Amino acid sequence: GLPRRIIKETQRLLAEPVPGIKAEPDESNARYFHVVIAGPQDSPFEGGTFKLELFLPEEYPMAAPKVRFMTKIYHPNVDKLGRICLDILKDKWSPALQIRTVLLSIQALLSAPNPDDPLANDVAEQWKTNEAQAIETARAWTRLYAMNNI
Amino acid sequence: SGFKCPICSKSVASDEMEMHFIMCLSKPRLSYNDDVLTKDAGECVICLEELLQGDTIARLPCLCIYHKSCIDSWFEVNRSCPEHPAD
Ligand SMILES: [Zn+2]
Ligand SMILES: [Zn+2]
Ligand SMILES: [Zn+2]
């Protein structure tokens, strides 16, 4: 059964949604949430609607939600499998955080990418060596994959 | 300590996080213009090294100047002008 914390978070997401973020529980397994995050204004992701899947592990809130992008996105902290390199999803998880603040943290990461994270990837390299072109590629991918995809 | 906003680097409590992050997502964050210093301008207030002609500098909207490296380091912990912390 769902612990009361999950029931409360779910009801508060329904009653008080986060601006710019859609988050609804899956109909079959209520530990899964289907998420749409609006691309932050004045980022290369502006105007995009990015689908994500969030899962609450059995140990939640002692373990972080597992979150991945389901929409292709060009971002130094999102790999080709949609996995997100974000400290609060790993070493810096705290049970004071909730679904709504985890999703806001991801949205804020879209606004302020971190290409300096130790894990070495090609997108972060592009962001550091040719930021203008990387931003334009992120814009192109937003218009190809994150518009009219909902 | 608390939870660090990636947009402005400020740390906030968990119960301030939602309204803070929404605010930082609502408007462009503080920025600067890259420039090459055209003439000596005294000491950079961050590192205390001279701002010399040719230096790789940042000019903020309040008109303050710093070495690009210095303001970038400060922006990692608080995205604000050292001289104009409340703009
Ligand atoms: Zn902030
Ligand atoms: Zn300096
Ligand atoms: Zn200033």
Numbering used by the authors:
A (entry chain A): 3 to 152
B (entry chain B): 141 to 227
Sentences from the paper on this structure:
Accordingly, we prepared the C-terminal domain of ZNRF1, ZNRF1CTD, comprising residues 139–227 of the full-length protein. Experiments reveal that Ube2N binds ZNRF1CTD with a dissociation constant (Kd) of ∼39 nM at 25°C. Crystals were successfully obtained in the P212121 space group and allowed us to collect a 1.47 Å dataset. The structure solved using the anomalous signal from the Zn2+ atoms contains one molecule of ZNRF1CTD in the asymmetric unit of the crystal together with one molecule of Ube2N bound to the RING domain in a canonical manner. The ∼520 Å2 interface area of the ZNRF1 : E2 interface is also comparable to most RING E3 : E2 complexes solved till date. ZnF domain contributes minimally in engaging Ube2N in the canonical manner, but contacts a symmetry-related Ube2N molecule in the crystal facilitating crystal packing. Moreover, binding of ZnF to Ube2N as observed in our crystal occludes the activated Ub to adopt closed conformation required for the catalysis. The analysis reveals that ZNRF1 : Ube2N interface contains three salt-bridges/H-bonds involving Glu183 of ZNRF1 and Arg14/Lys10 of Ube2N. Besides these residues, our complex structure solved just shy of 1.5 Å, underscores the importance of several other H-bonding/salt-bridges between various side-chains and main-chain peptide moieties, water-mediated H-bonding interactions, and hydrophobic residues such as Met64 in E3 : E2 interactions dictating the overall affinity. In addition, the water-mediated H-bonding was particularly intriguing in our case as no such water-mediated bonds have been observed in any of the E3–E2 crystal structures.
E3 ligases catalyze the final step in this cascade by promoting the transfer of activated Ubs from E2∼Ub thioester intermediates to specific substrates or to the growing ends of substrate-linked Ub chains. One such study carried out by Hoxhaj et al. found that RING E3 ligase ZNRF1 co-purifies with Ube2N from transiently transfected HEK293 cells in stoichiometric amounts. This E3 ligase was first identified as one of the gene products up-regulated in Schwann cells upon peripheral nerve injury and contains a Zinc-finger (ZnF) domain juxtaposed to its C-terminal RING domain. Though the precise cellular roles of ZNRF1 remain to be deciphered, it has been found to co-localize with tubulin in cells and ubiquitinates protein kinase B (Akt1), glutamine synthase, and the α subunit of Na+/K+ pump. Our results reveal that despite having a canonical E3 : E2 interaction, mediated exclusively by the RING domain, ZNRF1/Ube2N interface is ‘tuned’ at the molecular level to achieve unprecedented nanomolar affinity.
